[model samples]
Structure formats: structure tokens, C-alpha cells
Target: VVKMSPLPTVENQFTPTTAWSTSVGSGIGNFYSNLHPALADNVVYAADRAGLVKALNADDGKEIWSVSLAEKDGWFSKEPALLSGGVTVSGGHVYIGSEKAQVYALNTSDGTVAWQTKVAGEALSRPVVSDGLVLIHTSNGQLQALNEADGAVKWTVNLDMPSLSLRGESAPTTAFGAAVVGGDNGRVSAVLMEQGQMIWQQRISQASDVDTTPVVVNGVVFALAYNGNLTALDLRSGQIMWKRELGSVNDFIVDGNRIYLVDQNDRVMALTIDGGVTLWTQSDLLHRLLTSPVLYNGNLVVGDSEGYLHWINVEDGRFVAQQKVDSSGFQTEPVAADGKLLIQAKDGTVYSITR
Candidate 1:
């Protein structure tokens, strides 16, 4: 077994209070699925790997509705839902993807199946809703856009992929009327959102893949690779502005003028958004394999593989609080909104907490 850091503690810390807690079926269950919950308009939509999806009141965690996508191959032989990509809510529907090369949309009002469509491959990233299209990046290196009204193909853009790469894929982030996509081909490209045409492409890394979602802030695109560098590019033209030696598979959080990144080794740090200047580095959790950091109540928060969530000061990168909220551990980053921090544990329990 690898040696993880001993649990770090401070003398005085705020013990966060749980506002509400609820469970989905069996959670992702030690899978690579980043089935993080989605929050929109005071509703939290969460899902488990076995095809259970739920909508709850974000304030009280009361279940509004739920539906099971699990299906029977035969009368007695049941197949798990295999939901992998995280949940996404847009307009009147909640979107999710599965390992079976399928994407599903459900009605927000009643949790009924809106539509289910077969994609090119297993969609392992959150389905991004852009314009009137649902953008899905599948494991087969295809970026496909399906109509939101009906699950029909809009356009598909293919990326050059290596024979062997990481299991995860980058969900496209949109900016400047284009879909910014990071790919297994070690390049980040911009495609026209409406008519699927290549705007420009820049090679961000020569490593295997740019597997994390590229973050766009203030006309600049920040992209990182699995075992390569973090490169900043111009949002409109895909021109490289700067590059730094950093690597992460998880998407980093960009707050205002700073970027909070959890490195490939699980060490957390803060960097200036313009130049990628290293502001501070907290090396206490190195090698622990942490989730992407999320900003909660002014603190940078991340979860480890041991069921522990660590809260650090964003200003100076020090511990302000920590909590062990779930024993099943966390594979996805927590979602923060208003004043509530929503976390889904591997055991499929979703908890809402506040400081």
C-alpha cells in the first residue's frame, strides 16, 4: 500500500454542520465514474451507478422525484445502469451518461425519461448543454452534439486519439461561441458551437492526453494534461500565451484572478490566472489522490480517497477545516452553491453541509 499523509489538523477549526443527507441506490462503488451531483434553481440532481437518479430540494434535501434507468437484459438477468459521467441540468431536463455508450435525459418536473440516445462510445464526462445542443465527449474520441428537443445528432467532431490513454475524457467547456475541447491527442481545439467547424487548435502537451476540462476565464483558456504541462491560450484564436510544468487529471477551479489546482500527486496550490505564477503550495496531501478543488465559503476544498475532505485557506494555502463525511470515500468533486456544499460519496449518499 502507498503511504498517504497522516491526517492533518489545526488547533482551532470550524466543524461544518450537515444541513441534510440522503442516499441514492448503490453509489459509483469504487468505480472511475465522476458521478458528481448537479445543482440548479434550488434543486439537486444526483445519480448512482446502478441507474438510480434523484432530484431533491437543495435546501432541505427532500426528494422531489427519482427514476431508475436500470434495465433487464432478459426477464431475470438485470444489467446495472453503469452511469459514469456526472449529472447535468439545463432548461427543463437533467442529463446523464453511461458506460453502455448511452446518454439519457430526464424531465426536471417529474424525473421521467425524456429521452435516451446511443452515442459513439461510453460518455465519461458531464454532458454540456450549449445553445440547443447537448455536447457529449465519449471515450471513443468523438465530440458529438445532440439536439436538446429530441435526442438527434447535430454534429460530430473526431479527435486523434492514442491507442492507449487514460480512462477519463475531457468534457467540453464553452467560450466565445465555441466549444473548447481537450482531447487524448495532446491538443486542445475550439469548435464552432452552432455549426461544428474548427476554429483553431493548439498543442497543449505532447504527453498522452489533455484529459481535463479546459477552464476559460477572461478571454484566456487554461488547460492541463494528465502527465504534462498547464498551458494558457487565447480564448478566441487558440494562441498559446504561456505554459507551466504542472499536471492534473481533474479540472481545476478558477476563482476570480486565481486558479486552484490539485496536482497529479494530490498536492494543492494557488496560481495567478494571467501567468500561472505559483502563489502557494500545500504539500501535506501529496499522493493521496484528491478530487478537483472547489471553492466553498472562501476556502479551497478537496476530497481524498480516504473519505476526508480538507478545507484550506485560499489566501495563503493553510488548513482551516477538515471533515470525514463519508466512509465510502469520494471519486468526484463536491458541488457548492449559495451556502450549501453538496457531496456525493462512493456509497451513493449525498449530503448537504454548511459552515
Candidate 2:
């Protein structure tokens, strides 16, 4: 027999008023990457495994421009290849990495390729842009910084990676002049962003992969490993301030002094930003395969594998409302901005949901 909670079931109260729905293309194959879409100046940018990059009107979901990044060489394919990474929008340009080991910058206005450069390993996550450099984290445990102006290599730091790890990687985070990222070996590393010098590294877990990106707030770095270890590290020296065992490899949200996370088993947790104190845990959505939770309309909202969006009271983690987008299911966390929330499903449908 299984145990169940007896909390009052918060009812569904909000509907996902759709702003628009657009298709990018069927995403990367079975091993899918989080193809996170980007928003800038009322335009939404999205990429697909077919090497198609597009700019869409955020309100109407109409395609503004589209371009292809596929290469014709033998090592490349004319067929739709894996453009497996999140989209980054900065300084009028869009950056994305691919499973083909390439990083590209697209003209945000025209959707034309400004430049494309190859890396040593799979560029499988969103590139971090800061101080005129594009920071890329690769599958082979390489943290490389490339010149944003021309795609030239500025510096590289190689990490010792385990031979076997998870399919996805943690996106790089920046704090206090350092670029921080978690390694496949369950360690967190902080390197000087400008010079690429190693600052500090601290092991958080012994064997599991830290695939979830670390979130830095108020001089602290919070990293989560797949083995259920969550640690808060001192930003400057990589020292552990506190640790908690919570099994989650998904993205987390940090708002002010409160931190919100959804564990692997679809449990949502609220914690204090200072000392890893648990505020609450809601297990009402067990087995739903929840995405990372985001703060929307003063409530916590998350999408599940069944294409349902569930809203919970941020104060208590009780379900407040629910709505369905499509049966394809949402893998990307709901990107909220400009009075609306955006989500992309595995079937290549992009939705803009508003109250």
C-alpha cells in the first residue's frame, strides 16, 4: 500500500489563455535536450533539431524569419540534425549550441547566421554571455569562453569528467566575476570569467551527476545533483555552507530570499535562501513528472509530462489551478516575461499562456 496526504485539495482556478502556438519542428530524437526558447523585444526565438532557427512575434506566434544551420559535410547531415540546446538572447543576437559540436550566433532581427564555430565536444546547453565572451559548457567537461564579436576562442578550462553521466548538462552560471558550473563528477567549479583562471572547486556529491544548473543569489551558489544532494556553496571560495538531500536534476527558481524546486518524484519544495531550511513540500502531484517551477501571477506554476499546467499557492504548495496545453507534454520550464508565460512541448509546439 502507498501513503497519501490528506491536505485540502486546492482547486483549479486559472485558465491558460493562449496567446499563440507555433511549431518549430519535431525536437531532437529520443534523447531530447531542453530546447528552451528565448524572448526579446516582443519577439520569441526558438530552434529545433532540424537545424531550423526562427524568430516569432511573441504576441501572435507568427514567424518573422527562419534560417537553417545544417552543414553538408560528411561529418554533418543534410537531414534534420540535433540542435540540442537552450536559446540565449543578448545584445541583439541569439546564441545556441548544438549536438554537432557547433555554437552559433544569429542576427535577432533577421534570423541570419552572424557566425558559427565548432567546439571540441557537444555544445548541449545555453551559452552564457557576459563581458564580451560567450561561455559554453560542453559534454566532454570543457568550459570554453569564445569571443562574442567573432566566435574566436578566448580561453578554455577542462574538467575531469566521468565516462558515464546523464544525458543533459547543467547550464553555466555567473557570480562575482566568476563563471560557475557543475561537473559530471559531482563537483562545482568557479573560474574567473575574464581570465579563465580556476578560483575554487568543491565536491557536493560523490558519484551522481550535477546536471541541474546552479542558481546564484546574494553571494551564494546552490547546486543540485541527481543523487539527491543539494548544497549551498560560498561564491568566492567554493565552501559548503549547508547541504540537503533532495533528489532533483531539474532547474530551480530563486526569488528573493525564497527558493523553489521540484524533485524527481514530482514533489515541490519551498526553502529558505539562507540555511537550507525547508518551508514546505507538496506531494499532491506525485508521479506527474513535473517540470521546474516558476513564479507566475503570484503563484507557483509548473508543467508536467501530460501537458497540464498546475498552479500552486506559493505560500503552501497546494494546487490552486490547472490547465492543459497539449498532449505532447512540456519538457521546458515555463519561461515567464512581459506579462505572460511561455512553454515548449516535445512535439515542437510553443505556447504563450497568460492569465
Candidate 3:
């Protein structure tokens, strides 16, 4: 759940919708780490390089709980905290990983310590929970499965990911039970939730780098490579069904039959999943980015390196609206829940917005 940045949200149409600019510590700031927070059940939870995980009231940006992991060895500087453990509405009870090679089942109610165990060589990837199993990726490149009920080891698989010049927790990328994870080392692979196994593998591009997390939908995986290959693969087997060159850069998103991506030059692109042709590409919006594409209402949303948010029509590359979330720009995903956009900025300011 890492992103290019976060935004300070003062204009919101959230439930009990309201606006507040200054004085609310509700704003999220990310200085040293790339942290993507999650929103569920009216609560927003997130972790940071400072090893601080906080739960805030989603409606009005009020602190509900805060836990610090600063003392955890090797924890800081790594994008940790991935999950707000399901069903346990108790404040700090969360499923988060640390660079110290461990994943914790924390107590969220009061920020107390719960159960902690090593999932592998540093649970760097955003861990996912499915079929009651918690899946995580190690900084050393191994994927491990553990029972969510008791943190018991279920399975482990060495991804055998080839090392590149500058690669970190990329392939152990994103998950759903139909999880698709890929990164550098010239390849992309999918992991089956049934047995912690590699279901499909494909060479998305040649000699270029990729950290774009694969999106799974209707048993299909979609991703883009740093070398410019937009790919879709069969979920059961690593068979690539379609591919189009679009030069690598950052992340991607999908809505119905359309897939979207941005290049290193900040060009916004749109393509159809079935047609496999360039539907549209906008090179005018230039902003350095690491943020992935997000969709809300009827607009395809994304942010630039400059902390501005842009909403483009999903059917075409037409501009809808743009806003400067903050002067610095944000790099995280903009979250939408119950009609409000839960957005955070690079500076760690969290906000809720509406249509």
C-alpha cells in the first residue's frame, strides 16, 4: 500500500461533511517513508517511517488510537503497517509488518502490544488477509503464509527473484486472494491464495524495471513495466493474454474494460483490456509521480509529483477537475468510502473529500 504522496483535504463532501484547514492534526505527512493507509468501517488506519500507526475517525479526522514502533529494530525507514486487522474493532489490533523481519497482530483499541511473529526476512510487502491466512513478502525475497488466528506458520516459498541494481519490496506487491505481485528482476509472477504458490509468471518487459503492482479482476491480472509493457495474464496460469508497449514508470489502475497508467514523463494513458490499443494518452500534465491510478464516482483520479490531484474522464483523456491538495503534492492513493475520498498527502495530512 505505498503511494507517490498524500494530500491535505479541506474541501470534503464526506458524511457529516464539513471542512477544516488549519489546526486539525488530521493532515498526514510522509517525509521518510511511503505508507499507504487503509479505511474500513468508518476508521482510517496508517503507519509511517517513524513507526507510528494511528487510527482516526474517518468522518472528521479525529485521533482514535496511535501506536509507535520506533523502537522496533530495523522497522523505521521501511514502509510498514499494512492492515487494519478484520473484525477486531479494538483500537490498535492491526496486522502490520516491519523491516525487522516480523509481522505483528497488534492491539488497536488502546495501542497495546498483542501477538508478534516473524513472517520472514522483514515483512516489507503490504500483507494481505484471505481465507484466514495472512500473506507477506520478506525484504530478502520470500513469501510466507501464516494463520491469522494464531500466527502459526502455514507455508513459505522463496520467490527466487533475480536481484536488480535498485530493488526493494516490489514483487511481493499487492494481493487480494487472487493476488498479483511483481517487481524488478525482469519478471512478474502471481501467487495463488489456495497454497501460497506461483500461479502465473510472465516477462512483462525487457531489461526495464517495474514496480507496478498487478491489479486482479475477474481472474485476470493487469500490470505495467518500467520498460513500457502493459500486460494482462490468465489468473490460473501465467499465460499472458495481451500486451502493449507503454514505457515503464509507475503504477496502474482499472475500471471495467479500461486500464490506466502514467509514464515517467507524467503522461496519463488509457487503454482497453479487450481491444489492447491506446484509447488516450495525455502528456501535458507533467508532475513527477510514484502514485498509482485511483477511480471514484465517474472520474479516473491520480496525483502528480507536485501535490495536485487530477480527475480525468474514464472513457477519454478529458480533464475534469484539479486541485492542489497541498503546496508539496501527495504520493499515496486517494481512498473513497461511503462517497467521500479518503486522501493523504506526502506531508502526512489526511483528509476526506466528496463529489
Model 1 Cα lDDT, one tens digit per residue, 304-332: 88888888999899998887788888868
Off by over 4 Å in 2: 1-10, 75-77, 207-210, 247-249
- Residue 192's lDDT in candidate 1: 95
Clashing pairs in 1: none
Task: Give the candidate order by descending lDDT.
Answer: 1, 2, 3
Better candidate number, 1 or 2, judged by TM-score: 1
Poorest lDDT segment (10 consecutive residues) of candidate 1: 204-213
Q: Cα miss at 162, model 2 (Å)?
A: 5.2
Question: lDDT per residue, candidate 2, 151-263, as tens digits?
Answer: 99899998776476565557898886889998667788999988899988899877422255788888889888656577898898888999887655455778988888876
lDDT of 3 by residue, 102-181 (tens): 67776656666677786657554566666777767565557777777777888887665535433323534344555566
TM values, all candidates? 0.95, 0.93, 0.80
Query: Candidate 3: where is the Cα deviation over 4 Å?
Result: 1-32, 72-93, 165-179, 197-200, 207-209
Report how far residue 331 has shifted in candidate 3, in Å: 1.5
Task: Answer with 1 or 3, whichever has the higher lDDT.
Answer: 1
